[PDB]
Write an enzyme that holds these catalytic residues in place. Structure first.
Site, mmCIF file in Angstrom:
data_model
loop_
_atom_site.group_PDB
_atom_site.id
_atom_site.type_symbol
_atom_site.label_atom_id
_atom_site.label_comp_id
_atom_site.label_asym_id
_atom_site.label_seq_id
_atom_site.Cartn_x
_atom_site.Cartn_y
_atom_site.Cartn_z
ATOM 1 N N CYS A 199 15.585 -30.882 41.579
ATOM 2 C CA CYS A 199 16.104 -31.144 40.261
ATOM 3 C C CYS A 199 16.237 -32.642 40.003
ATOM 4 C CB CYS A 199 17.443 -30.460 40.086
ATOM 5 S SG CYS A 199 18.585 -30.888 41.392
ATOM 6 N N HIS A 336 23.594 -30.056 41.104
ATOM 7 C CA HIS A 336 22.425 -30.002 40.224
ATOM 8 C C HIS A 336 22.264 -31.181 39.228
ATOM 9 C CE1 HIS A 336 19.770 -28.114 37.041
ATOM 10 N NE2 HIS A 336 19.057 -28.011 38.151
#
Ligand code: CL
Length: 428
Positions: A199, A336
């Site tokens: 990510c 994330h």
């Protein structure tokens, strides 16, 4: 063996690459050839496509094919669970999500090639990779001209709404200032990216060229940079680590012998695919982009835990004159990363990114050598060397991210236009 050759010939004639990719994939699943199916997947071809009778004629495997069969049916009929999972994830996302890089895989592959061509390793004593173009992504102002129902559909399909809600509603991480978000049109949007790890890399590329890290080009550069510049980043990391424990008022120590192993590991991180990357990796990425990276994240998440990702990552190891002043913004939630991008002014768009939190406290500057620490007065002075800053009427210290329609990269423009075409052609 008994094929009407005339018929076959006529069929082959009317076929293009994407047809062959589809039919190759059909054989692929019969045969257990994952490359054949990946190749069809990455073409962007409808995974729902059903075999026509002509295709069935051409294929000529009575035991295997029939009008109406899809790749997913072939995958069940033969025993390809591996494939089924790829196929079904693809179908799920295709229906919930539609981002610029998925709309025309050939063009996103051209974008990849252009990024690769733009990427070099500095010669001499500091062998870090670096890009040679400054590129920054903004959502197009044309979105506002869409019918309301079409806008919400577009946002559902490009944003990560869950991330948006945690950074903006659940706590004041972003868009907490009426002045920035509304009067000055600098509302930030969190772009969706698949969570299959990486990510960080996908986010930087989305904030920048508008695509994900295809074929791992950015990642390998990051890995090779860290490896070929090990001692440079090792020293900054060591102080960063001590920085922290310094903050609890705790007096600790490690044996050089032991800073070593702890360093070797995070070094592997960039090589081990889809592992998690940390702030040293953000630091190196800022060097590779030759621009600052601002990260906004929770003030303390779990509260089972405090966080240390929020803040400003300057490409401190280059000469200032080597670096662009314009930053990108990343959002951080629960292990994330997301690209945080603004909408273009509806000439030059100026996006105002805060260098303070919602309580007006200066964001942390990471990997500062103790020779660089200092007052809030002094930190701010540093930030002003590396960014193009001003203070709003309301008193917020901000960095400016300036972009121009004129200077946009042409392949990116083409991709964004084609992505918009998909919404513009929707009735109603
Ligand atoms: Cl070392």
């Amino acid at each position: 063996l008994e094929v009407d050759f005339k018929k076959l010939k006529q069929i082959k004639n009317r076929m293009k690459k994407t047809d062959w990719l589809f039919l190759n994939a059909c054989v692929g699943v019969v045969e257990g050839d994952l490359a054949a199916i990946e190749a069809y997947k990455s073409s962007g071809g409808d995974i729902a496509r059903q075999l026509t009778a002509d295709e069935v004629r051409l294929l000529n495997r009575p035991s295997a094919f029939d009008v109406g069969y899809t790749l997913v049916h072939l995958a069940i009929r033969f025993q390809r669970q591996d494939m089924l999972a790829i196929l079904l994830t693809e179908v799920s996302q295709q229906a919930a999500k539609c981002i610029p890089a998925m709309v025309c895989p050939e063009l996103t592959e051209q974008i990849r090639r252009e990024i690769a061509a733009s990427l070099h390793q500095r010669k001499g004593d500091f062998a870090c990779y670096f890009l040679t173009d400054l590129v920054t992504f903004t959502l197009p102002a044309d979105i506002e001209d869409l019918p309301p129902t079409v806008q919400e559909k577009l946002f559902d399909e490009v944003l990560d709404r869950d991330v948006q809600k945690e950074l903006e509603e659940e706590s004041p991480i972003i868009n907490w200032s009426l002045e920035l978000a509304t009067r000055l049109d600098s509302r930030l949007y969190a772009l969706w990216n698949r969570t299959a790890g990486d990510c960080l890399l996908d986010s930087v590329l989305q904030a920048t060229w508008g695509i994900y890290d295809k074929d791992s080009v950015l990642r390998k550069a990051l890995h090779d940079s860290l490896h070929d510049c090990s001692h440079w980043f090792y020293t900054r990391w060591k102080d960063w680590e001590s920085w922290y424990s310094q903050s609890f008022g705790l007096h600790f120590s490690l044996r050089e012998e032991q800073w070593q192993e702890d360093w070797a590991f995070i070094l592997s991180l960039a090589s081990q695919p889809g592992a998690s990357l940390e702030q040293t990796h953000i630091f190196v990425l800022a060097h590779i982009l030759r621009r600052p990276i601002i990260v906004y994240g929770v003030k303390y998440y779990k509260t089972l835990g405090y966080t240390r990702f929020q803040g400003v990552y300057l490409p401190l190891l280059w000469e200032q004159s080597f670096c662009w002043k314009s930053p990108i913004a990343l959002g951080y939630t629960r292990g994330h990363f997301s690209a945080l991008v603004a909408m273009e002014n509806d000439d030059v768009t100026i996006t105002f990114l805060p260098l303070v939190d919602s309580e007006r406290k200066l964001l942390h500057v990471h990997f500062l050598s103790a020779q660089e620490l200092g007052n809030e007065e002094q930190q701010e002075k540093l930030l002003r060397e590396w960014l193009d800053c001003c203070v709003t009427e309301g008193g917020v210290l901000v960095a400016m991210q300036k972009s121009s329609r004129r200077r946009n990269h042409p392949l990116v423009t083409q991709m964004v236009e084609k992505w918009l075409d998909r919404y513009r052609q929707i009735r109603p």
